[PDB]
PDB file of C-alpha atoms (C1' of nucleotides) in Angstrom:
ATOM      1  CA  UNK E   2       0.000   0.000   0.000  1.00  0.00           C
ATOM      2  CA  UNK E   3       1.828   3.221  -0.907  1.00  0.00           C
ATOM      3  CA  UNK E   4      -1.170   5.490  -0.150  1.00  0.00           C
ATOM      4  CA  UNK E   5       0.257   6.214   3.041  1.00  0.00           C
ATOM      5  CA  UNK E   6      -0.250  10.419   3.352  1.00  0.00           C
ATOM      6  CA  UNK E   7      -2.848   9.505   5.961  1.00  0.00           C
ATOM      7  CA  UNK E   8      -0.139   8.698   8.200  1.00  0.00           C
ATOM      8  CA  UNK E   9       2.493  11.042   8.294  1.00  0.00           C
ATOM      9  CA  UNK E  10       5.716   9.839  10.136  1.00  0.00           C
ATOM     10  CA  UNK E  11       8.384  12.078   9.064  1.00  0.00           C
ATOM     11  CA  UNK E  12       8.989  15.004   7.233  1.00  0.00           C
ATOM     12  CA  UNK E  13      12.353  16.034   5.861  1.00  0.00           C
ATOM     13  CA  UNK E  14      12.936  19.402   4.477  1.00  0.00           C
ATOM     14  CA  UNK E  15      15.739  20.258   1.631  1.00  0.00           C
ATOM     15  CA  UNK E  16      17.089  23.956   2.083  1.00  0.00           C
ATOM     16  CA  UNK E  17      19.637  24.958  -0.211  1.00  0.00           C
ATOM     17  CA  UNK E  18      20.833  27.453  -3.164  1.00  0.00           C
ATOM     18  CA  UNK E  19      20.787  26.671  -6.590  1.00  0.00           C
ATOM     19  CA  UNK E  20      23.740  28.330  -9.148  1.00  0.00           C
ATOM     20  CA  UNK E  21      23.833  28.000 -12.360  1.00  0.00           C
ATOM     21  CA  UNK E  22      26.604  26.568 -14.367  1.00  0.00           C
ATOM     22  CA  UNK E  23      25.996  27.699 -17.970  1.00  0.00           C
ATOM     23  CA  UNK E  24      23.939  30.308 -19.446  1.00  0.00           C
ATOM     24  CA  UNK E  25      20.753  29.661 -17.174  1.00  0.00           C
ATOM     25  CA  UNK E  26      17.084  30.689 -19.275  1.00  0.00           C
ATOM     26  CA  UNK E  27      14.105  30.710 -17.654  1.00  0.00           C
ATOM     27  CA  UNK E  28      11.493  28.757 -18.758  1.00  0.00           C
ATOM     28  CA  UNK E  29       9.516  31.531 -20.373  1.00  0.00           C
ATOM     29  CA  UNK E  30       6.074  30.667 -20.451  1.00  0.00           C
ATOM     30  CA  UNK E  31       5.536  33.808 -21.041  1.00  0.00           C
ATOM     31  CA  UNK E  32       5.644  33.109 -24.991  1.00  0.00           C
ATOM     32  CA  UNK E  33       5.384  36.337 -26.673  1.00  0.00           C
ATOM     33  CA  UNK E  34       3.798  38.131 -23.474  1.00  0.00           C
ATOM     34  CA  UNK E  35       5.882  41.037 -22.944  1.00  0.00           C
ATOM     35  CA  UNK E  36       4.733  43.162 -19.722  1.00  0.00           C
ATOM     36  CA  UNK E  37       8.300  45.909 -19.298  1.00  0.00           C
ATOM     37  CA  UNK E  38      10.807  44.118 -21.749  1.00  0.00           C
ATOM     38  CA  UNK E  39      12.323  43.699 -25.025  1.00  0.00           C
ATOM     39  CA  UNK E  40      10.795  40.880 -26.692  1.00  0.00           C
ATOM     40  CA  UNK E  41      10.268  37.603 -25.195  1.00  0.00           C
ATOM     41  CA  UNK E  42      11.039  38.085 -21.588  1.00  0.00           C
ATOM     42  CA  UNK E  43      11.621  35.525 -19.334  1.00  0.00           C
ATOM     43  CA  UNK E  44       9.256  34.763 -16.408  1.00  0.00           C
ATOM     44  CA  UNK E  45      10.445  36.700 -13.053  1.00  0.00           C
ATOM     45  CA  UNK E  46       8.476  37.385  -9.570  1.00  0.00           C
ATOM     46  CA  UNK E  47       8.495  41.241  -8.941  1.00  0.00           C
ATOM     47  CA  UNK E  48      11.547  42.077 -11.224  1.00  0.00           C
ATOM     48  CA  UNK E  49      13.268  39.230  -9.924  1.00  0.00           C
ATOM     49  CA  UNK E  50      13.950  36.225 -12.195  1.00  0.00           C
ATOM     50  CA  UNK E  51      11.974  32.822 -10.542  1.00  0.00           C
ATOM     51  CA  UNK E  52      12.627  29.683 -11.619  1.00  0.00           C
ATOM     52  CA  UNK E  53       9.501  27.502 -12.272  1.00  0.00           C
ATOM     53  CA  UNK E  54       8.738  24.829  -9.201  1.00  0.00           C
ATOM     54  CA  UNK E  55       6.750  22.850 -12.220  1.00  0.00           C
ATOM     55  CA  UNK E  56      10.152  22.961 -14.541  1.00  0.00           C
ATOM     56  CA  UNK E  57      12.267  21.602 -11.686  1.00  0.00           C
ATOM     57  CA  UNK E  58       9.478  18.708 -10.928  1.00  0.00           C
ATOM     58  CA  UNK E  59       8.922  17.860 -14.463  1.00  0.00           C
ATOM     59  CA  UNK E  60      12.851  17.560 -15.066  1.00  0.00           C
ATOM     60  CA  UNK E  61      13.177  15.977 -11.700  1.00  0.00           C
ATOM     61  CA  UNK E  62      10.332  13.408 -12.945  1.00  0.00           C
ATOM     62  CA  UNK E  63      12.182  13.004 -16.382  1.00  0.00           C
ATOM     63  CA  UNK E  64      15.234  12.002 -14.840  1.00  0.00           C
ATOM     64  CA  UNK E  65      13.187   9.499 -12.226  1.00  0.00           C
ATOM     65  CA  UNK E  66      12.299   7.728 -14.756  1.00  0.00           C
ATOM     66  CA  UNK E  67      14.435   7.239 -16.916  1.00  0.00           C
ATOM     67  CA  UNK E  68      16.380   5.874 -13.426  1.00  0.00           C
ATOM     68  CA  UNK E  69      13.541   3.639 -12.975  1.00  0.00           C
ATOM     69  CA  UNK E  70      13.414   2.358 -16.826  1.00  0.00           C
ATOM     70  CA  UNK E  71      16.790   1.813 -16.458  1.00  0.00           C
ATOM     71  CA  UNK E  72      16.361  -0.343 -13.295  1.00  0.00           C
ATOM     72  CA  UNK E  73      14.197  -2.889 -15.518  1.00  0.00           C
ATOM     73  CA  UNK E  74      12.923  -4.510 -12.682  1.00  0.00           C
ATOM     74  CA  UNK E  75       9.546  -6.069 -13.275  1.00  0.00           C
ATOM     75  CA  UNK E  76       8.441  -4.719  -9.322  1.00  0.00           C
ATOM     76  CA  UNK E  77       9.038  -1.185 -10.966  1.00  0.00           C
ATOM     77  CA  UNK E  78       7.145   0.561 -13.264  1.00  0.00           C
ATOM     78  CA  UNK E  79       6.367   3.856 -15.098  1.00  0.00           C
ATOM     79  CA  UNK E  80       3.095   5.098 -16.728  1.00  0.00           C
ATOM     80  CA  UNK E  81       2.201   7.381 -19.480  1.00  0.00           C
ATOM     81  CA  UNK E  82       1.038  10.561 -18.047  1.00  0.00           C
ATOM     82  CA  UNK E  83      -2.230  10.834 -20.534  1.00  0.00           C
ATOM     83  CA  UNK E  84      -2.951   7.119 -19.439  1.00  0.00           C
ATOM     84  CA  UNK E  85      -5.976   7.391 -17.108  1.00  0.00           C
ATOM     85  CA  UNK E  86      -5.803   3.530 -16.539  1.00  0.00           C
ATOM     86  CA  UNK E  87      -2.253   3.758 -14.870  1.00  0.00           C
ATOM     87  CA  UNK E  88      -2.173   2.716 -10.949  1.00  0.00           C
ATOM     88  CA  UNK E  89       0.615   3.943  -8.649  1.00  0.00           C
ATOM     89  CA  UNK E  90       0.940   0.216  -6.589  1.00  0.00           C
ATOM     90  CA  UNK E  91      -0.504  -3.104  -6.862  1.00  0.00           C
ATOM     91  CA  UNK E  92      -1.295  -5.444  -4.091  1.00  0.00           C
ATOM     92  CA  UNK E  93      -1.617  -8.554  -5.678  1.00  0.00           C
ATOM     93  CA  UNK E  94      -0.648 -12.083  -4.441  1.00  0.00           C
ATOM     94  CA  UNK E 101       4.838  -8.689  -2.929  1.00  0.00           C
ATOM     95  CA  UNK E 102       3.521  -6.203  -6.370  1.00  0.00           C
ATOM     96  CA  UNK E 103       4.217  -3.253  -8.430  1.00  0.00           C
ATOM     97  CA  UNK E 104       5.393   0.056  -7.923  1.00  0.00           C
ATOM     98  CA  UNK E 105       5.581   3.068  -9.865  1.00  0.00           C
ATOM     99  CA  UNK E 106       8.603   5.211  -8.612  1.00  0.00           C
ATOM    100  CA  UNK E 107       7.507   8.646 -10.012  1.00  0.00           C
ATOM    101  CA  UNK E 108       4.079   8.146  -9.143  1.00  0.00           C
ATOM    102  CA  UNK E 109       5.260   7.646  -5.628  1.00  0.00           C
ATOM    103  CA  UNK E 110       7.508  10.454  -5.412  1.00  0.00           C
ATOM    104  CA  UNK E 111       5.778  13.385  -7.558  1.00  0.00           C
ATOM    105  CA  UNK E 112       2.746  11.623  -7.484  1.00  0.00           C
ATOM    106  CA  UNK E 113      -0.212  10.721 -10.450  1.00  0.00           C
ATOM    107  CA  UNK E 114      -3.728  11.180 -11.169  1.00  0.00           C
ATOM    108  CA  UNK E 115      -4.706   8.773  -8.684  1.00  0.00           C
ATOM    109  CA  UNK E 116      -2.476   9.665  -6.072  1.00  0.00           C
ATOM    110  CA  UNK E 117      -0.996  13.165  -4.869  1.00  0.00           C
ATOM    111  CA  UNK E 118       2.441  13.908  -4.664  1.00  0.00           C
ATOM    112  CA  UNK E 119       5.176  12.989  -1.631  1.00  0.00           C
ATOM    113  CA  UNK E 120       7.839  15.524  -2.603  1.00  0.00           C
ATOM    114  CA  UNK E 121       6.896  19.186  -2.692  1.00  0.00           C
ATOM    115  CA  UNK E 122       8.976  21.402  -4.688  1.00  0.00           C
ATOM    116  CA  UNK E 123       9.094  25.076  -4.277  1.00  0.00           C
ATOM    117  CA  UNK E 124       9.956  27.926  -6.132  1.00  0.00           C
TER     118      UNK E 124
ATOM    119  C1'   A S   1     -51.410  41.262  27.705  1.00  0.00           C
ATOM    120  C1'   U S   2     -52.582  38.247  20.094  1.00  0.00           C
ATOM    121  C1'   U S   3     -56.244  31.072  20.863  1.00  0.00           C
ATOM    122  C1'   G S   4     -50.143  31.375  22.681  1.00  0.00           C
ATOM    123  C1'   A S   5     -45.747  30.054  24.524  1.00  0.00           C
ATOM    124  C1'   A S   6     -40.156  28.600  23.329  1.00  0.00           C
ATOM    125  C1'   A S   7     -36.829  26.826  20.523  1.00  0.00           C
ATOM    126  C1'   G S   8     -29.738  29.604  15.849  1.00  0.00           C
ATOM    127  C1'   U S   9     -31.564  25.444   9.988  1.00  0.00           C
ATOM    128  C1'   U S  10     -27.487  24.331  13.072  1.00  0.00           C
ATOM    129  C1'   U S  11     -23.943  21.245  12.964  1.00  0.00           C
ATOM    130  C1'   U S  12     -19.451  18.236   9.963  1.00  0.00           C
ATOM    131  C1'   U S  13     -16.289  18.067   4.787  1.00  0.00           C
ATOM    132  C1'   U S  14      -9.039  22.035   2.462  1.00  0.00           C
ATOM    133  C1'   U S  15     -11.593  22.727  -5.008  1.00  0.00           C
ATOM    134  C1'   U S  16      -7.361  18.653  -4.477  1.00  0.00           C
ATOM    135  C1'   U S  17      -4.309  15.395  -7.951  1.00  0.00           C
ATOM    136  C1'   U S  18      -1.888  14.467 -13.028  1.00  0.00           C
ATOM    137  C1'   U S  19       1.689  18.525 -16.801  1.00  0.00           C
ATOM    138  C1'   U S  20       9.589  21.282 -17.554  1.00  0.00           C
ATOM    139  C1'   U S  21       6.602  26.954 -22.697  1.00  0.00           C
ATOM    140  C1'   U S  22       9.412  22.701 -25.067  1.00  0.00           C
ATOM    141  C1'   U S  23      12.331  21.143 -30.263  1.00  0.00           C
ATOM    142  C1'   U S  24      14.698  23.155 -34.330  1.00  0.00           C
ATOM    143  C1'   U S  25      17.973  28.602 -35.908  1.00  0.00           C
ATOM    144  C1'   U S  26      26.778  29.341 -36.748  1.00  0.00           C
ATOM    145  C1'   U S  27      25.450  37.871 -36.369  1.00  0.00           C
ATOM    146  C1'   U S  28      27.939  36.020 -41.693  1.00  0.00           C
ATOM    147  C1'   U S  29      28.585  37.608 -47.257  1.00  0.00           C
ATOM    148  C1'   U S  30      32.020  40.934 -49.685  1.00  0.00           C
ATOM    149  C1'   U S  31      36.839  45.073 -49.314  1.00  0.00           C
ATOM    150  C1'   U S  32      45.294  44.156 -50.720  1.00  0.00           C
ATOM    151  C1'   U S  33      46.784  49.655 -45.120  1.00  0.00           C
ATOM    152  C1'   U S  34      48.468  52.004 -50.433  1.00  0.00           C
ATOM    153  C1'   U S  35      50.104  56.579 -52.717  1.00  0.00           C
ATOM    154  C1'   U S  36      53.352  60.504 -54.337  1.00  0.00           C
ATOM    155  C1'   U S  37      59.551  61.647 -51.587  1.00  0.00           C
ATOM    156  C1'   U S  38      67.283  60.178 -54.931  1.00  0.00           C
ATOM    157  C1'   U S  39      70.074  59.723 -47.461  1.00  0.00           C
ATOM    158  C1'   U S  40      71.148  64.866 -50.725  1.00  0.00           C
ATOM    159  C1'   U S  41      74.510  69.692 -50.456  1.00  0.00           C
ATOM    160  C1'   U S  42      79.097  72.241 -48.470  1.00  0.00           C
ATOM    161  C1'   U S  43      85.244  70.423 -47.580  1.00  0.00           C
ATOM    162  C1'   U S  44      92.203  70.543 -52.553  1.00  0.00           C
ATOM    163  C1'   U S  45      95.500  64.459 -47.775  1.00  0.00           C
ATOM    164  C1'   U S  46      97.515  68.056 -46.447  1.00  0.00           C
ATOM    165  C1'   U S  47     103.130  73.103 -44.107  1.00  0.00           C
ATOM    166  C1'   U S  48     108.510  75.834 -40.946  1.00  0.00           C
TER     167        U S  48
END
RNA sequence: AUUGAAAGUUUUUUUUUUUUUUUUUUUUUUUUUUUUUUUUUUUUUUUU
């Protein structure tokens, strides 16, 4: 059973700063939404430049599984995202798991890992 | 001193989950640092 969040038995909270290597760009949803800059601009929260808490989870999720694809273990799975039939565990008689459903969660279960801005 | 009255429509329930504004796009193509100007003029290898 890995619908646990009734239960909550510890929490752990990551605090750190993030610098960029390379020539970070933000995401830019913004696609040709200017509001006080040339162009494109990228996204930013009050003048100051935000990077996306959905761009971090979705790489984050990316790279999960492709980790868990690369496992090929037949107790872990991953499921399309636009599949609706998908489950996050099975209990059938030891059973599957689905590693990013567990972690950033699917449609029919929430997420365990919160990521902020 | 209404036939005659005194009672809260109240408790209880998170509008929540799934989703990277992403891929592609070489600030390059052309243009001789050349061009007119004499290293020239003056001076006895020489006297008591």
């Amino acid at each position: 059973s890995c619908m646990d969040l009734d239960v909550i038995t510890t929490v752990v909270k990551i605090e750190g700063k993030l610098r960029n290597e390379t020539l970070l760009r933000v995401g830019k949803g913004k696609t040709q939404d200017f509001a006080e800059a040339t162009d494109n601009p990228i996204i930013k929260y009050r003048d100051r430049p935000l990077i996306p808490g959905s761009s971090l989870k979705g790489a984050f999720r990316s790279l999960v599984e492709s980790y868990t694809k690369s496992l090929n273990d037949s107790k872990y799975y991953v499921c399309d995202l636009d599949d609706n039939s998908c489950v996050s565990c099975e209990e059938k008689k030891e059973g599957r798991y689905c590693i990013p459903c567990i972690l950033f969660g699917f449609k029919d279960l929430a997420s365990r890992v919160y990521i902020l801005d």
